[PDB]
Every structure is written in structure tokens, then in C-alpha cells.
Design a protein around this ligand. Structure first.
Ligand SMILES: Nc1ncnc2c1ncn2[C@@H]1O[C@H](COP(=O)(O)CP(=O)(O)OP(=O)(O)O)[C@@H](O)[C@H]1O
Ligand SMILES: Nc1nc2ncc(COP(=O)(O)OP(=O)(O)O)nc2c(=O)[nH]1
Ligand SMILES: Nc1nc2ncc(COP(=O)(O)OP(=O)(O)O)nc2c(=O)[nH]1
Ligand SMILES: C[C@H]1O[C@@H](n2cnc3c(N)ncnc32)[C@H](O)[C@@H]1O
Ligand SMILES: Nc1nc2nccnc2c(=O)[nH]1
Ligand SMILES: Nc1ccc(C(=O)O)cc1
Ligand SMILES: Nc1ccc(C(=O)O)cc1
Ligand SMILES: [Mg+2]
Lengths: 562, 588
């Protein structure tokens, strides 16, 4: 049986925050087991070589399967604080653990008495003890190098461990790494300097990490993934413990603990503050039969001129579609989804690579080239097709999977979202049926609750199969198996996603005009919804009339500046 | 002989014909009693019991006998009788017998106790309520009451009811008054040239008017015990404290409000609402955002110039606009835009008249097709048309033009961008016999060529609000109804762009008043930063930039919907309407 470890990841670098954490995740999963749950990233109050690291890292002596999983019996057992495996390392009693914990916390309090980006993860580990895991985590750190990256073990199974005075020499360390890693012995590549001094970075071991119930940041992350867990060291479960921290703090100091401590999501390479902006997603139908667009952008050169336009016009994201999903549509049978889309993506990249070479020949050469890729519009593909999406992430042609129907069409597409070092974010929309039948499928016992419940289960599936929680965006699918009164109701109750990253697509849909040559009327109705969306703090809105949506939000933003 | 100050309370049950009924009653009242020098809002109140045909009204106005007295219609700036009244000091000695405060209270509480009993045994509508201050030439409260009974009868749910709430500082209770026709005649004919002819008289009324007067009671029995009365008087005499009152009006209103909420635990304001009036009907304050459609009939307007000079086009445009959702249309003959020089070859008046008259000519052809058997009965069909007709506001500061407009029944609202300061005389034109007119007081400084230079305020938000409130006090003193006076902060007029924005930011200070805004196509919008077509946009100016200016427009339109602005004034009616519909839908 596999063990369960819960880890904590820390950095101080905001600029590079994602690349550092995700690189540290890649390597953890590699040398330790599958990552089967994760928190969001959290901003809390107390790299030009990183790519080169990946094809030089040493392989693991354990290979886990790439297969999708739907369950994890060990996780279910961890969570009940029940026994999975005899502890190799000596356990201690709760009373001795809390004595020797509380001593280290008062001493640490004394020394210090003279932002952080965070993440919890759950690992289904093939490592047999805590100590070994710890030695492996130190290795990964040094391979990179509390500034840079910090990985701590919070819970390893249900064990209560406390070991002072651990001294490990270059022999001990070697014996432990090479039980788990194929280490390179060769002169022209090795890390045997590192392995030799890795005992200097370990003086003691202690599960649970004993700041676990005493640090908001930790509780805050653990609250996303193991709210019901109650280690024996704890007097109440993580969510109850969280709640007794927030409450006490807001009672004692009467400031909102939420104010400085913020949830973050990621789209591409940088962190976003959840709910703190409404980005624009420019639409680009590259096909012969979309309502409102068909055929305008089939030619790759008109389709690329247009991307460049919306980018300029204000859109943060661009969302390519090769095939309509609109009511009673019959996709153009003369050219496929893939044939339409590939040239246009491929043309975009080549056009951006001419841009980058024309710039290549602040104010320096890197200063100039960093301003160019620092405004590259994010590219989001609107498909459900394994083989096309594969071809996009293999050629470096997209950043975001927009799977309408939440990766239920072919769940295997989920495995392409993590590619080695490279992660990719995903939009899970709600919908039923297909274009001819969706209208007819509108019975819900509890429209609002049911749909939230649908998306939440899809999320649990994706995080369990190793997609980071902070890359998953929701969408209620306005117009997709809703009547117009239902579509409007979903907007009315949009406050139920107030804890989640949220993406909406109203643009040009029929329900808009149901509120009232009259394309004019529908676009304007849209701009209203954009205001509503602004005030509801929707995270991303997906629209065709970028220039005009921009105008709205500029005005709305200005009015609401202190 | 100084004049007396009386405070009257008007009350009706008929919501559809509400405005006409009260404004008919204010006309007769001013005519026979004095000058109206102050007024409250109208309020929709829930009846306090326990402590629709008017097609004859118009033809009553010119047939009413004259007052023997006559006030000068000159503008006034003060009323000493009032000042005095407000300190509960004496004006004139009471002809009628006064009574001690303790005897007064005793007799009142019997009348109230007995009314409660009546109504307890008993057990349909709301009450629309207005209060008014009159500087009066009637020498005593009884004679006034007789003139009020006369007025009511001249008209006759309870259709109209007019009571004397205060008459000077007097404290009076006459328990059983008995006036025969002779007595009534003596009293009315001292103040009115009554017709004496067989084919024209009201001697059947005058003779029996006594039946309608059983006692006399100043202050009114219920003055301090009805929210609806306190609610009104809080507008007009808040600081007053009679001898019967343990504290002033405002203190007493807040006492009432706390007591209510600290008992029945509901908000008293939720079910008693402030109304305002644009033309012929009540509008519930803050309950809606209406769209005002801009019509510039001149060669020099910053975005419309030269499009609507031809009357036929300009009149089509007014039909398009009403169709597209505009509740009011605002015709403007001269431009006030920055640095503009108005075309000196044709006059504001020349431009606006052929239009306003054509439109009337046209609308009347509509009614005649409908009536005829083209385009609910006859009465039904024809009522619908008139309810459909757009309100007309005229944007000018010219006495001679507004005189002409009003004289021909061509407009319904003065939109005076100078807050009626260019020519204060224009105020006397807001009230013409039976017919009253609503007015929009906007804040500007300077003129199109100097406004931009006049942007030093000590306190922008509060200075503009003071100004507007002073302009309101001046109009209400000169007899314009407060429910017809609308505020506008004047965006872009003698404000820097940051200052226009700021005014929007603190627009909540107008949370108590009717509010009119015009952001449309102004400069400050763009300072913040299946196809879209602008319409009714000069081909001369920046096409791409005004796409952005118009759509920023729509953002304020949304913002305005949320802040509860009463009227927005826009070029893009179709679009603004689209936004308002959707937002409306989302919020049911
Ligand atoms: N201002 C006033 N002061 C004293 N008595 C008054 C008065 N106005 C009316 N009355 C008296 O009130 C009696 C009933 O007349 P109405 O005014 O019709 C009662 P109402 O209208 O049902 O109640 P309300 O006056 O409280 O609105 C008459 O005998 C009349 O003399
Ligand atoms: N996440 C998400 N993606 C979407 N993609 C397409 C459309 C339909 O819009 P459009 O692209 O204009 O039409 P077509 O499907 O015909 O391309 N709607 C959504 C949506 O609501 N949510
Ligand atoms: N009450 C009020 N009336 C107004 N009239 C005209 C203009 C200017 O707009 P427009 O008519 O388009 O320009 P011009 O004055 O050049 O006709 N602004 C206002 C305003 O803000 N408030
Ligand atoms: C930098 C210091 O942090 C300690 N450290 C890191 N993670 C853990 C854990 N889960 N338990 C105990 N100690 C830990 C190392 O032992 C080192 O001494
Ligand atoms: N609120 C209210 N109450 C009343 N009670 C009796 C008579 N009139 C009225 C009236 O006009 N309004
Ligand atoms: N793909 C879609 C396109 C349009 C609509 C809609 O108009 O309701 C719904 C789905
Ligand atoms: N009448 C006016 C027209 C325009 C502006 C403005 O754009 O600032 C101000 C006043
Ligand atoms: Mg004008």
C-alpha cells in the first residue's frame, strides 16, 4: 500500500512565482508519487536556466502509471486518521509531541523577535518513511538554489513523529537518495557535491510540521483540500480550526484576515488575484458556420490580422474555435476543425516570431524582448478533440483548453494539461447534449445548485488526476441547455461562484434580446451584462466586440478608483 | 394690516388623475386665499385611520368667479410674515376665540378616541398628499374654512380634501358651529364676486355649505398624529413648534419614525413614497431611470450639428426616439458646447418653432386616424395615444421663446441650464392659471468660451449641491411646486474632467431629490481611457473615438441605473434603452 503525504510549497518571488512552484511540483511528483489534490495559490503576509534543468534531471526508480484515476482508497483512509502502514520511524505520544513542539515555537518566537506565495498538495507517495521524503525534498530545493523555494512535510500518514538531533553524512544521504533516484555518477554530470553536504540542512524531523495549526497560511491552503481531517495532535478538524483562527483574529484585532490574504489563479505564467479584475477574452471563430461570424476569418491572414486587432483593442485572451456549437448548426463538412485551426495558429506564431526578430535587430536587448512576450496575448482553444489539442501543446501553439462539456467527451484530454514541466489551464463549461438537442434538455430540479454541483465534481476529478486547482476555471454555459429565463437566472445567482475563478460567454446569444438590424440591440444588451459582470467581479468575459466592451470597463474602472 | 400665514393640507385618493386634481386645487386656493410661498413633495401614503372621471375640470377654470383681492405677480425674495410665523410669534390678534393648550388637548383626544371607535367598528387605495404654505388675505380661520369647503364643492375614494393645519400661532377649538346660507353668503361675498344670474350661479352650493362645517379646530386635530401630515410638513416648516407641540416638526417626525420602527420593525419609508412630476402623472422617486432624447435643431452642435435643421427630418427623429424608448425629448435651438459660436444667420427661435408646431400638427393627425377607425373603446384607444405621446422639454434660457412655447401648448418642461438665472422672470411662466410646468435646474459657471477656465471650487461636491438647493428655495418661494423641480449637476460645464467624474462618484448626495444627468458624448468620458454602428453622428468628427465615447456613455448609463438616477439625457436612445432593459430584467 502507498502512503499519503501532505506538503507545503513556499516562495517569495512574485514575478516568477508560478514557474518556481510548478517546477517544484513537477519534481516532487517525479521523485515521490502522484499528486492527487492541490490548493489554490495564496498571497499571504508572514530563471533563464530553469528550462535547462528539465532534460538533465535524473530519472526515478519508480514509475507510476499515466492512467486517469477515479478514486484513491489510501486517501480515504488518511482522511479518517486511520492506519495505513506501520510507522518505520519511532512514533511519540501527543503529550510529548506538544511539549517539544511548543518549546521550538517559543524559541523561534524569541529569535525572530528582534509577501509569501503558498500552496498545499497531497502526494500518493511510494516512499516508505518521512525521513526519506524529507531528504528528497531538500535535494530538489538545492537542485534549484526563505526566499527561493521551501517544501515542508505537514502530514505523513497519521504518524505523530518527533526526532531531535538527526545527523546525516554524505554516505547516509547517498544510501537514501539512490534507493529512490537513478543518480548520474559521471564526471561531466553529477550533483555529488550537493549530495555530500545535504545533511547540514537537516537537524530534526517533526510530523505534523508543528506550525501547521499555528499558521494562517497553512490552514488557509489545507482548508481547500482536507477540511474534514483531524490528526490526533489537533483538537478539532482543519475547517473548524481555520474557522476558530479567522474568528479569534477578527475578534481580537477587528481587521479582516481575508483583506491581506488573497486567493490567486493562473492563466498562463503569472498569478492573478482572484476577483480583482475582469479580463477580456476576444473571440475568433475560424469556420464557415458560426452565428454572427461565419466565414469572416477562415483565410489565415484575415484571422491573424484580427487577433492582432483584438489584442490591441484590449483583449487579454484569444479563443480560437474551429467548429460551431450554436443551436441546430451543421458544421461545414468540406473542411475539418483541425484543418481550419492549425494554419491560423501556426501563422500567428510565425508572425509573432518575426515580431521578436525584428525587435531583436530596460532598453537593452533582454529589456526589449521581455516587453514583447509580456504582452503576448494568451491563446485559448475551443475544442473537445484529443488529437487536435495534442498537436497544439506539442507545437507550443496554445495556453488554455476551453472544453465546452468539461472534458466529458473524452476525459483522456486531461492528461495533456500537464506535460512535464509545462502546465496548461482549462475552462470547464456546463452543457448537456449537442447542438440539435441541447434546447430540449432544460429540466433541472434546482437549476443553480445542480450546475454548481456539476462543475464542482468535474473539478474534483481534475485535481485528483493532477491538474492544479488554480488552473481550473468555471463556466455556467449561458445558452447551453438553458431556456432564456434560465440563462438570466444563472446571472442572477452568479454570487454562488464567488469563491471560484469564473468565465462567462454571453456575447450575441439569444437570451440577451429576450430581455426586451437589431444586432445593434443585442450587442448593447451585451455591454450591460459586461457592467453587471464588472460589478459582480467576474474574472473573465468572452465577447466578440472587444473595443466596445473595453470602453465600458475603462469607464467603470475609473469611476471606481479612490 | 399684515397678512396671515396658513398651512393647508391637500389630499386625494385618485392616482391616475392625481396631479390635475391637486393642481386644480392649488389654483383655486391661490386665487381665493393668497400667494403660495411654499410646498412639499407629493407623497404616496398608507391610510391612517387609527391613532376616474375629470373630463369636466378644464371647462371649470374660465367660468370661476374672480377674487375681490389681487396679489402682484412680481418675483419676491423674502416673506416677513413667514419668518414671524416660524417663531410662533403673533401676527394679528385672533378675531375668533382662542383656547388654552390643556383645553385644546382634552377636546382633541375625545374627537380622536371617538374616530378610532368609528373606524374600529369599520373593518382599497393609497393617499396622495401635499401640504402648502399660504400668505393669506383672509382675516380668520373660519372664513378660510368656508372658502375651502366652497372650493371642494366646486369640484365634487375622496376626490379632494383640503384642511387647515395651522393658521398663525392660534390655538382654537369651537365645538359646535352652525352657519346658515345667509352666514355663508356674507362670508364668501366678502372675498369673491359671486355670479348672481339665473343661467349662471352656485347658490345651491352656497346655501348648504354649512352642513359641511361642524366644528373648528386649529391646529388640525390630527396634525401631530399622522405620519402623512408630519411627513409633508417636514419639507416646509421643520423648525416650527406650535404651543400644542412638545417639540418642533422635524423632532416630532423623527420621534414618530423611531417609535414605528422600534415597534412594528418595518421601514416606514418603504410604504410611504416621495413623488415627483414631469408632466401629468406622479413618478415614484428613485424607482426608475427614464431616458431623455436629445434633439439639436441647429447648425452648430458638437455631434448632431446640421442633421436636424430641416423640420421634417427633425420631426421624424422625434418619432423614432419615442419609438426607441425615450420618455422625454429635449429640443435645443442653440449650442452650449465648449468654444462654440452660434450661427449668427438664423435665430434660436426660428429654428425651434417650425419643429415644435409641426410635431403637434403631426401628433394630432395620429389621434384623428386612431379615432376615426384606423391605427378599450373610443375612450380607451384615445387614452392610450395620449399616454404614448412623449413629454417635451425645451432647452433654452430665453423668456421670449418659452413664452411663445407655453402660449401655444408646445412644451411640457423648461430645461434651463442657468438654473433660471439668466432671466429670473422666466419662473412666472412656469405657472399659468390652471397649467403648471416642470423645470430642470442645472449648474454651470460662465459661458461656452470661459466655462473651462472657472474650475476652482472650495468644495466641489457640496458647493454645487448648495447652489442647487438655493435655486430650489427661490422657485418654491415664488410658487413653483417642489415636486416639479429637478436637479442636474451639469457635467462638463465649468468642471475639469476629474471633477465631472468626482461628481458622479458622489452622486448619492442627491439621494433625496429628483435628479437629471447628461453625460452623453461629453469629453470626460474618453478621458477615462453584426457590427456596431453609431447613428445620428456628424460625419465630420472622429468615428473610431466616438465609438468609444458612445460605449462609455453606456457605462454611465449602467452606473446611473444602479445609483437610481431619475433621468438620463442621451443621443443614443436605442442603445441606452437596450442597456436599461437588460439590467431591468436581471434585477426582477
Ligand atoms: N382645518 C380644520 N380645522 C378644524 N376642523 C376642520 C378642518 N377642516 C375640516 N374640519 C371639520 O372636519 C369635519 C369633517 O370634515 P372633513 O374635512 O371632510 C373630515 P375628513 O376629510 O374625512 O378627515 P381629515 O380632515 O382628517 O382629512 C367638518 O365638521 C369640518 O368643519
Ligand atoms: N467557455 C465557453 N466557450 C464558448 N464557446 C463558444 C460559445 C458560442 O459562441 P460563438 O463562438 O460566437 O458561437 P459558435 O459556437 O457558433 O462559434 N459559447 C461559449 C461559452 O458560453 N463558454
Ligand atoms: N439639463 C441639461 N441640459 C443640457 N443641454 C445640453 C447639453 C450639451 O449637450 P448637446 O445638446 O449634445 O450639445 P449642444 O449644447 O452643443 O447642443 N448638456 C446638458 C446637460 O448636461 N444638462
Ligand atoms: C530548514 C530546517 O527545516 C526543517 N524542516 C523542513 N521540513 C520539516 C518537517 N516537515 N518537519 C521537521 N522539520 C522540517 C529541516 O530539518 C531543517 O533543519
Ligand atoms: N394618510 C392619510 N390618512 C388619512 N386619513 C384620513 C383622511 N385622509 C387621509 C389622507 O389623506 N391620508
Ligand atoms: N454556441 C451557442 C451559440 C449561441 C447560443 C444562443 O444564442 O443561445 C447558444 C450556444
Ligand atoms: N454643452 C456641453 C457640451 C460638451 C461638453 C463637454 O464635452 O465637456 C460640455 C458642455
Ligand atoms: Mg443641445
Amino acid at each position: 500500500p502507498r502512503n499519503i503525504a501532505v506538503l507545503n510549497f513556499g516562495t517569495n518571488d512574485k514575478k516568477n512565482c508560478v514557474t518556481i512552484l510548478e517546477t517544484a511540483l513537477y519534481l516532487t511528483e517525479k521523485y515521490l508519487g502522484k499528486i492527487i489534490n492541490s490548493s489554490y495559490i495564496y498571497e499571504t503576509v508572514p530563471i533563464s536556466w530553469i528550462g535547462d534543468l528539465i532534460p538533465t534531471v535524473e530519472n526515478s526508480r519508480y514509475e507510476e502509471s499515466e492512467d486517469l484515476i477515479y478514486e484513491c482508497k489510501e486517501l480515504e483512509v488518511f482522511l479518517k486518521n486511520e492506519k495505513i502502514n506501520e510507522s518505520i520511524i519511532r512514533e511519540v505520544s501527543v503529550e510529548d509531541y506538544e511539549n517539544e513542539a511548543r518549546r521550538i515555537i517559543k524559541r523561534n518566537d524569541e529569535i525572530m523577535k528582534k509577501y509569501f506565495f503558498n500552496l498545499t498538495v497531497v502526494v500518493r507517495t511510494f516512499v516508505e518513511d518521512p525521513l526519506a521524503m524529507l531528504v528528497i525534498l531538500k535535494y530538489i530545493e538545492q537542485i534549484m538554489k526563505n526566499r527561493m523555494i521551501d517544501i515542508d512535510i505537514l502530514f505523513f500518514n497519521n504518524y505523530t513523529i518527533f526526532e531531535k538531533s538527526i545527523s546525516l553524512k554524505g554516505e547516509d544521504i547517498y544510501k537514501i537518495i539512490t534507493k529512490y533516484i537513478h543518480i548520474n555518477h559521471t564526471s561531466d554530470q553529477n550533483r555529488l557535491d550537493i549530495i555530500q553536504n545535504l545533511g547540514d540542512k537537516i537537524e530534526f524531523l517533526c510530523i505534523p510540521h508543528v506550525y501547521t495549526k499555528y499558521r494562517y497560511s497553512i490552514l488557509l491552503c489545507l482548508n481547500d483540500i482536507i477540511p474534514e481531517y483531524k490528526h490526533s495532535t489537533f483538537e478539532e478538524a482543519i475547517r473548524s480550526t481555520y474557522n476558530s483562527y479567522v474568528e479569534s483574529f477578527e475578534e481580537k484585532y477587528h481587521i479582516n484576515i481575508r483583506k491581506n490574504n488573497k486567493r490567486l489563479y493562473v492563466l498562463k505564467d503569472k498569478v492573478s488575484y482572484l476577483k480583482e479584475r475582469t479580463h477580456i477574452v476576444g473571440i475568433l471563430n475560424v469556420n464557415y458556420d458560426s452565428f454572427s461570424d461565419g466565414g469572416l476569418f477562415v483565410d489565415p491572414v484575415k484571422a491573424v490580422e484580427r487577433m492582432f486587432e483584438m489584442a490591441s483593442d484590449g483583449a487579454s485572451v484569444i479563443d480560437i474555435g474551429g467548429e460551431s456549437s450554436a443551436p441546430y448548426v451543421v458544421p461545414n463538412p468540406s473542411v475539418t476543425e483541425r484543418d481550419l485551426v492549425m494554419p491560423v495558429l501556426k501563422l500567428f506564431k510565425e508572425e509573432w516570431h518575426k515580431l521578436e526578430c525584428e525587435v531583436g535587430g530596460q532598453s537593452s536587448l533582454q529589456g526589449k524582448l521581455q516587453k514583447v512576450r509580456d504582452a503576448k496575448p494568451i491563446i485559448s482553444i475551443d475544442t473537445v478533440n484529443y488529437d487536435l489539442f495534442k498537436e497544439c501543446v506539442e507545437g507550443e501553439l496554445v495556453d488554455i483548453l476551453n472544453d465546452i462539456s468539461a472534458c466529458t467527451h473524452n476525459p483522456e484530454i486531461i492528461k495533456l494539461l500537464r506535460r512535464k514541466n509545462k502546465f496548461y489551464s482549462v475552462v470547464l463549461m456546463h452543457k448537456r447534449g449537442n447542438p440539435h438537442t441541447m434546447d430540449k434538455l432544460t429540466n433541472y430540479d434546482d437549476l443553480i445548485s445542480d450546475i454548481k454541483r456539476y462543475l464542482e465534481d468535474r473539478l474534483h476529478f481534475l485535481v485528483l488526476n493532477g491538474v492544479p486547482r488554480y488552473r481550473v476555471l468555471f463556466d455556467v454555459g449561458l445558452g447551453f441547455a438553458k431556456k432564456h429565463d434560465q440563462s438570466i437566472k444563472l446571472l442572477q445567482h452568479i454570487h454562488v461562484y464567488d469563491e471560484y475563478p469564473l468565465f462567462l460567454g454571453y456575447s450575441r446569444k439569444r437570451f440577451i434580446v429576450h430581455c426586451m438590424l437589431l444586432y445593434q440591440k443585442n450587442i448593447c444588451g451585451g455591454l450591460a451584462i459586461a457592467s453587471y459582470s464588472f460589478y459582480k467581479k467576474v474574472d473573465l468575459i468572452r465577447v466578440h466586440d472587444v473595443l466596445e466592451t473595453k470602453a465600458v470597463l475603462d469607464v467603470l474602472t475609473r469611476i471606481h478608483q479612490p
